[PDB]
């Protein structure tokens, strides 16, 4: 299951078909647990902006190589879909939103990542909660594809990667959880949208 | 053999009042393990011989399915005109459906919103030993104008009745294992007619010719 | 404009980009008046009245004309209209609405896939000021961040998808209203519909 | 923790920032058990059962105790609790829920301003695994982009606004459930309520 | 004088069946111009002597308002137990309300969702010569489980009846001129009782003392 | 009715009360019609980005002095509310979104200007449609204040200025219109929100 294959053979169609792509075992046990620890590190040192504990990583951070690995690893796959994903000309990506979600019975109401057209067109999420039994611990992502007669409960299973369109096509809510959960989110811009979105400023 | 079905008593003394009061009626241990597992096989067979398929009941390798349908009919028969104001004159084929276990769920919806004639939805679950607590697949019903709602388990050998119009909206929680169910809709004499008139059944129509004579 | 041009250069793209298409001055005040007269006369032989017309019936010639000219447009869009293979049609729903002060709740024509894929409406209300008598059709094209109010303008023709893509509500009217409606079936879908019924 | 500290240092701010406040280990497994026994015994003299308790009745002493200790918390929050002037209370709604597989539809306690401003619930279900038996209370704090699932944990006390600010639904239970509920009235509001009724 | 009111015929032959069938009933030219304009003055007077006020009917300068109420009662009286299954044993005071003309509207809502005893909302419009086409203020009702909805004009000397439970949700379009209306709710014997029991009326209560004896 | 008065005496309270402030006759007939023409100018020359004809003005544009007047005129009022409007520390503002709305029966579904927290906290709109009879031509703004039992239909009357919070508190839809209408929209940032919103990028 090589790199460009996953991209042009599974992602692109599965995405242009439904608008949701799941990828199990993206980096492997050892490589994943690595990030798994590397993220728990940041949970202590500080600089964690924003309960709702999140923080933004650029990849070249002090000692956060593996997070950078993951990021730069996703970049490949998205690059390998150039012009294939809808009419979207994808170029840049936000910094990695490494987030530690509370898990105290807290859930997040349904919403849309990019309803205004702020540029973000492909949400990309990585789950790193080792042995996160969603059957008991809960904390599942639920997506309601606009105009479809079905919906999907995606579990934050360990070492799972998830893609979906960020616009009004994918409204989604997150069932609450009872244990602490970690996850890394990333968005990708459409060259035109991200640009048009910038004429507002000075 | 099959479990004895006192269709008359079960209709008049239980199903009818239940339906009238609540609009939802469950009947467990409908055909017994013996017939149930059998239908299990019969349906898992058609898998070979989200996908569905329609059955009249006479098809080969579908004997017990036709049996199930005949039982459903047996129950609706002894209801008479007591089951709501509806006069049930007929029904659809049996929708034998294979639902996948990929964590897929079904949005809130209503079987018959347009008024196409269907008045009573009827479902039968044949999943041998299905723990809804483990695999999910629960069916959530919201009885219109009530302060409660109900999570019905797709328990093995369970039969489910409910009105199909705006009165019973429902969701289907995702399942994490393949699941099987047979659905049937009963028609109200009048509504089905006006439906056929209004072209809400897709049965009628008018041919559109390839061309017309100029002028 | 010829039917082919109107079809291929206007209707097909308008229907693909939006799923809603208006066509003003379809048959001209000349023929439109006759269609109107036929209908008004037809509905003299206070809720909403509807009588289905084949087109061949007496005193319903011009109605049939309208239907024919509709079918031609549909012929020119054959294959190019969405992803549908249209082979069927419904009788002309000649409908006389009350105009008392009651609108029709927001809904969708074909929610369960009964075969119908294109709703096609023709208005006959001469000098109908929507800002005075109302009866406006509000459509909410699913997905699009805008919505539209279509006025029952005389001699107006209106196409739109029948599925969940175009839910819509009718604003109340304060005067007698007339509108002929037809639906078109997708060859496959309508056939897939019949399957559930007994032989 | 003393009632005053718990009141002024925890409940008042928690109620102001959110309008929802949980308090675990309110009376301890010691007294909680007795409250439970009183209730369970009380409900032996399959839909949901409810019997209102004043607290003074026989075999309902400990219930009354719970009520008292609730009132004290309310006394310590006097004036500081939202913008309400609490002067009244309802009898203890001792409720036994079925646990058959039926939840209670999403709703709001006080939608028309009947006087009630604070819903206050105390759970008595020993060793109640919400992940096995369910019966969870899901609240949607209006305005906030999050929502919460409150587990009917034994000896748990739960405060929340009764108005449109906190709509909420109860997940179905798969075992017999017990929960005592009380509401508090805002002096003005409840008085403004009576006005509409005849002398 | 006032217009003759055949309360008996109007109740039995029109209002009752109308209500039962649709759940909404309008009665125009209820009291005639004479009494109508009078109530006009009577209410515009209380403005002096979004604001509201409650009236029993006996208040000075409210004679014709009490009259209006007595008429409403007259009509509901001759309904008997025919008006739904409800047994109307009483009602609220008359809510005389002054609605402002600042382009303010009222969200979709339901008078009695909790089940507080109110079963029938009753409204009377006294706006001398109000063109709803010009100033708006229309009341839109959505009869639960129906394919139509209705825009009721707050026409002068108009009386309006409808169920107050989940069956009749409604919106009020904004008005661009001051508007006046008198509302009244009738109680169902049973529901009001269970309501008083459930403390849904705010009437009952329990005193909370300033302090308690320590220990 | 001087400048700082309108600000601290009417805006701030009316805003902290409801979250919607209307101001009739902001610049006056002659001064308003001026913008009224100055905007119709741009409708021809070009450079109108984005039917839905809109364009972004910085105020110092060629010959667009009066638009700049309006912008710089609003700036005063918002400056005169420093720290008074909620807990919002307002600093910057987007470029003026001068928009020519179609008016062919087109309406805009209800929405929220800033549901994600992109910085914008105060929507400010100026209407310049001379004698725009909304009774006939229509095209009215309808706002549904979150948690309130009433809603408001604000007419785009000529020379009217409108303020409202942009976040989830003010969902709003626009009734369709039948004639061409022009309007100038502006947003204001909360120093903290606009800042936090920027950690995403690189
Ligand atoms: O900044 C934004 O627009 C923004 C950020 C995050 C976000 N999402 N989406 C799904 C999240 N999630 C939470 C737990 N599991 N998943 C989550 O946090 N959506 C939008
Ligand atoms: O064609 C129709 O009208 C139609 C089809 C399906 C359908 N439903 N609803 C809930 C179903 N389900 C799935 C699993 N367990 N239950 C199911 O099959 N209802 C109506
Ligand atoms: O059978 C159905 O579901 C069904 C039938 C008709 C219908 N339509 N369509 C357009 C209508 N209209 C336009 C102006 N006044 N009325 C109208 O009533 N929508 C749905
Ligand atoms: O009268 C009313 O509207 C009314 C009454 C009770 C009520 N609540 N509140 C908390 C309940 N609950 C908690 C766990 N199981 N049930 C519950 O049923 N909500 C509203
Ligand atoms: O207290 C209550 O339950 C209560 C109050 C008001 C109310 N409504 N509803 C529509 C009203 N209206 C306003 C103008 N024309 N009609 C009006 O007054 N309904 C119920
Ligand atoms: O870019 C954005 O997020 C954005 C831009 C504009 C916008 N709004 N709001 C009200 C508009 N309008 C239209 C007619 N009358 N008013 C309008 O255009 N909302 C959000
Ligand atoms: Mn998200
Ligand atoms: Mn269904
Ligand atoms: Mn329609
Ligand atoms: Mn409740
Ligand atoms: Mn009301
Ligand atoms: Mn906006």
Numbering used by the authors:
A (entry chain B), F (entry chain B): 188 to 237, 253 to 404
B (entry chain A), E (entry chain A): 184 to 232, 254 to 419
C (entry chain C), D (entry chain C): 188 to 232, 252 to 405
From the paper:
In metazoans, the α/β heterodimeric hypoxia-inducible factor (HIF) complex activates the expression of hundreds of target genes in response to hypoxia, including those involved in cell growth, apoptosis, energy metabolism and angiogenesis. The activities of both the PHDs and FIH are suppressed by limiting oxygen, resulting in HIFα stabilization and activation of the HIF system. Most of these compounds likely bind to the active site iron and compete with 2-oxoglutarate (2OG). Many bind in the pocket occupied by the 2OG (CH2)2COOH side chain, and as a consequence contain a carboxylic acid, which is often undesirable from a pharmacological perspective.
Recently, a set of tricyclic PHD inhibitor with linked pyridine-carboxylate, dihydropyrazole and triazole rings, such as 1 and IOX4 has been reported with one compound being in clinical development. This series has the potential for more than one mode of iron chelation and 2OG competition; we were particularly interested in the possibility that the triazole (an established carboxylate mimic), rather than the pyridine-carboxylate (an established 2OG mimic) might occupy the 2OG (CH2)2COOH binding pocket. To test this proposal, we prepared and studied both the acid and tertiary butyl ester (IOX4) of the ‘tricyclic series’, both reported as PHD inhibitors, but of uncharacterized selectivity and mechanism of action. Using an antibody-based (AlphaScreen) in vitro hydroxylation assay for PHD2 catalysis, both 1 and IOX4 were found to potently inhibit PHD2 with IC50 values of 4.8 nM and 1.6 nM, respectively. To obtain insights into the mode of PHD inhibition by the dihydropyrazoles, we made attempts to crystallize the PHD2 catalytic domain (residues 181–426) in complex with 1 or IOX4; a crystal structure of PHD2.Mn(II).1 was obtained. In the PHD2.Mn(II).1 complex, the inhibitor coordinates to Mn(II) in a bidentate manner via the nitrogen atoms of its pyridine and pyrazolone rings. In contrast to previously observed binding mode for other PHD inhibitors occupying the 2OG binding site such as IOX3, 2 and NOG, the pyridine-based chain of 1 extends towards the entrance of the active site and is positioned to make electrostatic interactions with Arg-322 (which is known to be involved in substrate binding). The 2OG C-5 carboxylate binding site of PHD2 which is reported to bind a ligand carboxylate in other PHD2.inhibitor complex structures,is occupied by the triazole ring of 1. Based on modelling studies, IOX4, for which we have not obtained a crystal structure, is predicted to bind in an analogous manner to 1, with its tert-butyl group protruding towards the entrance of the active site.
